[model samples]
Structures are given as structure tokens and as C-alpha cells.
Target: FLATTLERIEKNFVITDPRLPDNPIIFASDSFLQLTEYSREEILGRNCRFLQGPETDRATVRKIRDAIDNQTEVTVQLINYTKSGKKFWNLFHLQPMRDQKGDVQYFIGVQLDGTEHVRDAAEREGVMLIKKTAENIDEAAKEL
Candidate 1:
């Protein structure tokens, strides 16, 4: 299913392998490039915090940091800017990657376009829908 989704959807997804700085990290998807206005080369060998700016929430940033420290998955909605300085809300769903030894080495991210989805859903329904959907993702990951 993951392979099929990658083959067909424009939806963005990234898998950080256990070999990156933390070990072998891998991030892909053109949608991520579209959101950050970063050529793939620029984002490599780096952390996503580079996207955070003045509008980004410090608590959420801390939460992400804590999640990385704990080697766990986290979902957060926060403000961030692209390389073009275009500010937008992003829904970041992240998970940690571990090697066979069960040592965490990478962080995975699934970035959902909040503006586009919210605009499409309309204000009331949009926020509620995302809340419900995110709840489900959160629950599922907890089961793992």
C-alpha cells in the first residue's frame, strides 16, 4: 500500500532511514518541495526545524523536540514559513525510525497542507475534520 500510494498520490510523505545524522535519513515527495520551496538538495542532511520562523509556535517546536528525544511519534499544528517567507499553518505528523537493534535513528514526517484542506473544508468543518482525522492517526500510532 505504501509503495502504491507513493506511485500514485501527490500527497507528501517522507521516510528517514536509520542511517542519517541520527543515521540514514531519507525524505522525499514533490509535495514537500512545493510546500517548502526548497530544491530537494537543500533539505537533505537537515532537520525540518529549518522551516520554523517567527510565526512558529515555541511550544509546538518544543513538543517536536521532545518527541525526537523520546523517539516517539507526534502530531502538531503550527505556523511556519517557506523559503519564500510565505507563512502558513502546517499539520506535521511524525514518527521515528529504528534499526533492528531498536535504536531510533531517523524521523519521518507527513505534511498536510492546512490551508488548502481547511479552505476546502470551510472554517467550521475544516478544523473539526482535521481534529477527528488527526485523532485517528494518533490512536493508530499508539497501537504500534
Candidate 2:
């Protein structure tokens, strides 16, 4: 079941260094390459921070960094850019994996596009606000 599950998922997966000046990506799944439009060579040995764009939130970056330092797991939705500079929202999850010696060895990360879900919620709220405003206007018109 587990093997089949990994083969049929939209999530992108990566493993990163836990003991470096920068947490460079060491391994990336094929799903990750297809998701980011990046080749295996382009992704390997590069920091995942390369995915961050101008709109990417620095607070989220700090949160992730702190978690990594403390050897904890973090789940965050952050804006990221593709190799082609295409903007997208990523539901990013990061976890620290330890070695036999109980030392942090690598960080496992999973990501998926979260833009549609975020956008849909915002659109629904917007439509509800507009409907409320129109109803209020009609009530005032009746009073006048």
C-alpha cells in the first residue's frame, strides 16, 4: 500500500542537508522535478530557498530555520517560484530525520500546490461580502 501510495500522488518530495552553511538539496523525487519544471541536475546541490520569490514571506523562512535548528517539524504554506519564474503557493511540510546515533542527518520536505484552495476560499468570502453590501443598500433604499 505504501509503495503504491507514493507513486500516485501530486506531492513533491526532497531531502536536504542538515549540517551545512546552507541546507542544499541532496535528493529530489521525480514528482518534485515535474512540479517545479526543474531537471534533476538543476535541483541537486542547490538550496531550496531558491524557490522563494519577491512575494515570499520572510517570517515563514525564519520559522522553518528555527525548526530545523531545533530538530522539529514544520508545516507552512509559502509562496514560491518555479525555475521559469512562475509564481505558486506551496503547502510546504518539513521534518527532521535522525541517524542511528540520534543526530540529525537530513531534512525531509514535502510540498504541493496550495494556490487553488487559498484562492477559492478568498473568492467565496468576497462574494459573501458583496452580497451583504447589496442587501444593506436595498434596505436603506426602502427606508428612504
Candidate 3:
């Protein structure tokens, strides 16, 4: 679900951040540029806050902050405008990647442009699991 979703959205989509904390965000799509009117160098490290005049959702902003604070993964549906002010619905998933010390060093975020349909399949045996376990449950449950 994670890999496929990211690869799908990454197709002609932008994912960029400022090289420095204070600089403009980078225009980071391998192919997304073709879909938008802006050039690659024009929009990089720029704060997305400018897109929000007074209509931005306060709840959503708080959710984003809390998610990062706890290094938690979250998915949100949003209506965002392009540089040309064309509004587009986006589904963004931000998952944290931890370091060897069990601290979050970075995150893996996927910005999908549409809905996720898990239809037509009675079961998905092809899905992979990286980290899920029940082995320690019995031992841990003793403490409870």
C-alpha cells in the first residue's frame, strides 16, 4: 500500500522542501512540471503559507503540527491551489523514518492526487508487512 501509493502519486507530482530552513522550497517533481505552468526554479523552498489567505483550515494546521511532534503518520485530504491558482484535491501521507537510536530523523511523505479504491479484490495476498508482530504480546500482556 505504501510503496505503490507513493510511486503512483509521484508520477508527475511535486514533492519539495527548502534546502535551508529559511529558503524557498524546491520544485521537486521528476515529471510534475509538465502538469503545472510554473518552471522548476520558480517555486522551490517557498512557504506554502502564501496560498492561504484567510481560508486555510486551522484544524488541519494543528493536525499537521501534532503529527510531526509525535512523529506519527497521518493522511489528510486537502483542496490546494497550484501556482496558477488552480485548485486540486490532494491526499497526503506523511510517515516518519527513524534512526538507529529510535529517533525520527526524517519522513516519507506521499502526496496522491486522487482517492484510493480497494475494490474488486476479495483479498490482497500481495500486500507486504515490514513491521507488525504478535510474538511479544503474551509477554507484554503480563504487565497489564
Candidate 4:
């Protein structure tokens, strides 16, 4: 239900199952698929590391990994590649979601194309909006 509700919003984001091996993406937004130029079949169940290419920063990658291990939220700007191998600056925000029991359940990753000079405030606002939406939907689903 959460995934379906999230699909209604045209956002560039992905939800990954932390309990799964490799923390594979379980749901990806249509906007994300369009931005990355990847089909659903190619993206589902795959780790997001596939987007990293030669020009991607290893330090930034390590930071994200650390954040995931710590189950903390992080925002970073890094280079990412599309399926066509075109590079683009990505402003990425990752946050862990916990269930009522306080156990980490999933991770939400929001991506913004930072190729153009976008304001930091706007990017932060967008991420917050998506986070709120996901939280609302998740809470409502639990009532069902």
C-alpha cells in the first residue's frame, strides 16, 4: 500500500529493504526510472551501487556506506551515471525508516539531479516533503 501510494507522487526516489542481502531496492519511483534511464526490471532487487561509475567519488560512497551501517540519515552531493553512461551531479538524501518497535525496516533514498545550479534550500525542502509523505503513508498502512 505504501509503495502504491508513493507511486502516485512524481518523485525521484527509491525504497530499499535493509533486511535484504545487499539492501536491494524494493520500490523505485517512476521519475527515478526516467532520470536513470533504467527499466523497472533492471532496477528492482539491485543495489544502487550500479549507478556509480568511474567518475564517482569513492569518499562519498564510503560516507553513504557508513551512514547505512550506522542507520542514520545523510545527504551528499556526488556524481552518478545513467544507464547510458552519462554522468550527472546528484544531490542524494538517505534516511532510515523504523517500525513501531523501533527496528530499522527500510531505507528511503531521494535523488535530485544537481547538474544545474539548484538552491540548497529547495533540495532540502524536496527531501523533507518526500520524507513526510512516506512517513504518513507508512503510518496509515499500519492501521489497516
Candidate 5:
């Protein structure tokens, strides 16, 4: 059900299941696949840290870890590598999706390519859209 909704959003993003072991990716958008140069089969069930290369900041990764542990929102700009080892600046936004019981069920990770131009407005808009979609999915799941 989550895949059905997320697949329609034309953006570079991935949804990870926090309840699962290692917090593996459950759904990856088409744009995300294209940006990372990875196929769906290669991405799913894997932690996104795979994108991190030698130069990837450990401090930035720690920040993301803290946010996930606290179930808070976070946005960071960090260097990430594609499958072919090409580096790109990623403006990564993360939001936790909670269920009716207020327990986080998934984490939405939105990646915006900030290699050349950084569009703050677009990233904000994408975060809003992602939040709304997550809420809508939670509400829909209640009926099931």
C-alpha cells in the first residue's frame, strides 16, 4: 500500500522501514534510482549508507542517526556517491511517519541533488508534500 502511493510521487526519495532489522529501504522512487544509478533490486532491503563514500562525513551521518533515534525531522547537505563512484551534493531531508498510536512506522528520506543549484524552496515544498502523503497513508491504513 505504501509503495502504491509513493511510486506516484515524481521525486528522488526512499522510504525505510524502521521496524525492520537494519532499517532497510522498503520503497525507492524512480527518480531516486536514476540519481543513484542503482536499480530497484540493488537498493531495496539495504541501508542507504551504501551511498556514502570515503569522503562522506561521519558527523553528518551521526546527525541523521540522532534524528532517527528521536523521531525528529532533519535536513542536511552532504556528499554522496552514485553507483559508478560519481560524487554529488545531496540535500537530504528526513521525516518520520507515525501510525495512529504515535509510533514511528517508517522514515521518509528525500534526496535533492544540490550539485550545481540548491533550491531551498523546492526542498521545502517536497518535504511538505511528503509529510502530507505520509499522513494520508496513515489515515488510510486505519480503515484496513
Candidate 6:
């Protein structure tokens, strides 16, 4: 049941073999190619970290690395860039897949866009700050 769900899921999907040096991507869904603006051929043999941009947080990168090393699941939000340099927030979930011997075999990653949601909240906070400042100005004028 779960296997079918993973195989057919629409969100961006990536699979990497931990046994490989640098954990190069072994498979990527069509959706992931569309989201990252990279062709499947260009990314299949590369590390998924190409999504990281200059704005990508070091702490979040460390968290992901630590999770993969420990064979644990982790969810993180990172600022990522497309192939053409368009930036977006990616809410990423990574899970480790183990074989029957209980040894980790692969790391699967699922990514969803979170740019609009986080950006809108920051814009709202800016508006609130301006509103409060105006209120304070009006109070000062009343005293003058």
C-alpha cells in the first residue's frame, strides 16, 4: 500500500544511495525535474544539494547531513534556487530506507514549495509594523 503511494506521489521525489560516495541521486520524479528546472538526465548522477543557493542556511544543511548520517528522518525548510536562479523556499522531508538486514540502503527525499506561505507572513509583519508606527506618530502629534 505504502509502496504504491510513494511510487505515484505527485510531489517532488528523489532517491539516493547512501552507499555511494556523495550520495548521488539514483532516481528523481518528473515533478522534481519540473520544480528544480533541471532535466532528469542532468541530475540523476549528481548530488541533490545543487538546489542550495547562496542564501541557503548552513544550519539547515548541517541538520540534513546529521540526519542522513544517523539514519533518521528529518524535516527542514531551506532556501533553494532553480537552475535559472529563481529562489524559492523548499520544505523538505527526508527518510531513510533500510533493507531486510536493517542496514540503511537509500535516502528518500520529498520536497514541497513553501515560498508563498512564508513570504506572505513576512509581508504581513511588515505591514503591521508600519501600522503601529503610524499610530505612534498620531499619538505624538496629539501632544504637540
Q: Please, what is the TM-score per model? A: 0.67, 0.71, 0.54, 0.82, 0.80, 0.74
* Tens-place lDDT digits, model 5, residues 56-127: 889999999999998998877789999999999887778877777988878878776756435578767755
Model 3 lDDT tens row, 1-144 = 122233233343333232357433333353344444555566555544443333446677668668866778665555555567766544545555454576654334444443342223311311111111111211222222
Ordered from best to worst lDDT, the candidate numbers read 4, 5, 6, 2, 1, 3
Prediction 4 TM-score vs. true: 0.82
Candidate 1 backbone collisions, by pair: 18-24, 19-23, 19-24, 20-23, 20-24, 20-25
Error of 6 at 37 (Å): 0.8
Task: List per-prediction Cα lDDT, in the order shown.
Answer: 0.62, 0.67, 0.43, 0.79, 0.77, 0.69
For candidate 2, give the lDDT of residue 31.
Answer: 73
**Any residue pairs clashing in model 2, and if so which?**
none
Query: Clash pairs of candidate 4?
Result: none
Model 6 CA deviation exceeding 4 Å by range:
1-8, 116-144
lDDT of 4 by residue, 44-139 (tens): 899999999998899999999999999998878789999999898887878877778988888878787867435678766766765675555455
What is the clash count for each candidate, in the order shown?
6, 0, 9, 0, 0, 0
> In model 5, which runs have C-alpha deviations exceeding 4 angstroms?
1-5, 116-144
User: Model 6 TM-score?
Assistant: 0.74
User: Which window of ten consecutive residues has the lowest lDDT sum in model 1?
Assistant: 1-10
lDDT (Cα) of model 5: 0.77
Q: Model 6 misses residue 12 by how many Å?
A: 0.6
Q: Order the candidate numbers by TM-score, best to worst.
A: 4, 5, 6, 2, 1, 3
lDDT, residue 57, model 2: 90
Highest lDDT against the true fold, candidate: 4
